[PDB]
């Protein structure tokens, strides 16, 4: 259950620094 | 500690999925 | 190894709830 998390988690990581990545040049074209 | 665990993995992965479809959503409009 | 995890956990919830605070106001910015 635990080696399945640690899995998901850094999976979940990747994912959510794209979503920094992107959200990052949305807020500087939209400004605002 | 572990189903507590799980619990907010699910959790996470359906928020980041609703993230990243509102993501996409902006950039084609914004990319236009 | 799970106390790792936990703070892993943790730090992504903070994340994914700043970014959809941010998504959010995109969002309203942008319009429909
Ligand atoms: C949890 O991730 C987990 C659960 C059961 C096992 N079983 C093994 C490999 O014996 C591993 C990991
Ligand atoms: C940027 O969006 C970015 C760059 C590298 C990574 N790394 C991995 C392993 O996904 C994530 C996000
Ligand atoms: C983890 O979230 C966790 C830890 C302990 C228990 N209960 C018992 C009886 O150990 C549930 C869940
Ligand atoms: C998002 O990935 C998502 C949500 C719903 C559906 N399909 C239906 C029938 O709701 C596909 C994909
Ligand atoms: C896993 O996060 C983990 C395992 C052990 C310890 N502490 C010691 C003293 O072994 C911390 C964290």
Do not use: P
């Not at 979940?12 to 605002?32: C, D, I, S, T, Y």
């Amino acid at each position: 259950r635990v080696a399945r998390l640690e899995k998901k988690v850094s999976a979940l990581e990747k994912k959510v620094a794209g979503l920094e990545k992107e959200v990052a040049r949305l807020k500087k074209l939209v400004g605002e």
